C-alpha cells in the first residue's frame, strides 16, 4: 500500500486568473492533512479563496484518478518483472542548471526504487540537492502514465503481450546478447547533459509550452 500520487500543478495567466508551476508527491493513504491547508501554505502570495478552491480541485482530481502500481495491486509478485521497460526522459531546470537525460526503466518490477536512483544520480553528477525530488517525481509521473494507459485498455498486468499496437510500440525491445552493447547512435541520447543557462534562454524554453 504505497500510493504516492505524482501531482503536477500548472496554471497560466491567460485562461487562469493566476500563474503557478509546481510538482509534488502526495501520499494518498495519509488522509489527515487537509489539501486546502496545504495549498494555502503553498501560495503565500495574495480572489484568493476562489483560487485555492480551483487548485485543490486539481489536486483532488489527480488523487481520484491516480492508478496505483497495478502489480502491487493485482497479485503477481514475479521477481524481476516481465521486462516492460519504458523510456524515461528528463528535462529539468533548477535555477541556472538544466539536466537532459534518458534511461530505460522497467515498469513491471516493483523493487525499482525511484528515490534510490535519483539520489545516486545526484551523487554521481554531483547535482544540486533539489534535483533528487525532481528526478524522482519524473520517474513516477512517467511510469504512472503507462500504468494508467494499460489500465484503461484492460491489460491484466500479468505478463502477456501488450495488445495495443501503440502502447506496445513505445516499449523498449527485447535485449538479446547482441543488443547489450549500445550502438553509437543510442549511447548519444541515453546519457546525461548538464548545461548552464540564463534567464534569457529560460525564457525561450518556457515559451515552448
Amino acid at each position: 500500500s504505497e500510493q504516492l500520487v505524482p501531482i503536477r500543478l500548472e496554471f497560466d495567466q491567460d485562461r487562469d486568473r493566476f500563474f503557478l508551476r509546481d510538482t509534488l508527491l502526495w501520499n494518498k493513504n495519509d488522509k489527515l492533512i487537509k489539501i486546502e491547508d496545504f495549498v494555502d501554505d503553498m501560495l503565500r502570495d495574495y480572489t484568493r479563496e476562489q483560487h485555492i478552491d480551483t487548485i485543490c480541485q486539481s489536486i483532488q482530481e489527480q488523487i481520484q484518478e491516480f492508478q496505483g502500481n497495478p502489480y502491487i495491486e493485482l497479485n503477481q509478485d514475479r521477481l524481476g518483472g516481465d521486462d516492460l521497460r519504458i523510456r524515461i526522459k528528463l528535462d529539468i531546470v533548477v535555477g541556472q542548471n538544466q539536466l537532459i537525460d534518458q534511461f530505460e526503466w522497467d515498469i513491471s518490477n516493483s523493487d525499482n526504487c525511484p528515490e534510490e536512483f535519483a539520489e545516486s544520480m545526484c551523487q554521481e553528477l554531483e547535482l544540486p540537492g533539489e534535483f533528487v525530488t525532481a528526478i524522482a517525481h519524473s520517474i513516477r509521473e512517467q511510469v504512472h502514465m503507462y500504468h494508467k494507459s494499460l489500465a484503461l485498455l484492460g491489460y491484466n498486468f500479468d505478463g502477456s503481450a501488450i495488445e495495443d499496437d501503440d502502447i506496445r510500440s513505445r516499449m523498449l525491445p527485447t535485449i538479446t546478447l547482441d543488443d547489450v552493447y549500445r550502438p553509437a547512435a543510442e549511447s548519444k541520447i541515453f546519457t546525461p547533459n548538464l548545461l548552464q543557462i540564463s534567464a534569457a534562454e529560460l525564457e525561450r524554453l518556457d515559451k515552448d509550452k
Binding site: 504505497e2 504516492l4 501531482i7 509546481d22 509534488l24 508527491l25 502526495w26 501520499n27 495519509d30 489527515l32 492533512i33 491547508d37 496545504f38 501554505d41 503553498m42 503565500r44 528515490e115 535519483a118 539520489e119 540537492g129 533539489e130 533528487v132 525530488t133 525532481a134 524522482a136
Partner: protein, 94 residues
C-alpha cells in the same frame, strides 16, 4: 556562525537524538508499517529543516523549500514542518 535561539521549553531537542515528544507527535515514522518512513528518514527530513533554517534565522523556512530538497511526500513534510514550528525549532526568530 549564527547563535541559534530556541524557547526554554525546547532544550530537549538534539539533532543527533530522537525524543519521545517527537515519537508522540509524528507516530507515522516509527510504526515500522511503511518502509520509506523510518527513524533515520525522520532525522534526515527533520534536521534538514532545522539546519537549513539555522543558516538564515531571519528568513522564513517553508514547506515548499523542504519538499523541493527532500524526498518525502508533501503531507508528511507539512506535518513535520508544523511540529518543528510548534516547538520553535524552525522559524522562531523570523
Amino acid at each position: 556562525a549564527h547563535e541559534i535561539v530556541i524557547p526554554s521549553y525546547s532544550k530537549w531537542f538534539n539533532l543527533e537524538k530522537i525524543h519521545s515528544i517527537e515519537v508522540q507527535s509524528l507516530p507515522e515514522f516509527f510504526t515500522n508499517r511503511i518502509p520509506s518512513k523510518t527513524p533515520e528518514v525522520y532525522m534526515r527530513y527533520r534536521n534538514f529543516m532545522v539546519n537549513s533554517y539555522r543558516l538564515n534565522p531571519n528568513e522564513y523556512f517553508s514547506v515548499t523549500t523542504a519538499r523541493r530538497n527532500v524526498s518525502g511526500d508533501a503531507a508528511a513534510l507539512f506535518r513535520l514542518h508544523k511540529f518543528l514550528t510548534k516547538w520553535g525549532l524552525i522559524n522562531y526568530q523570523v
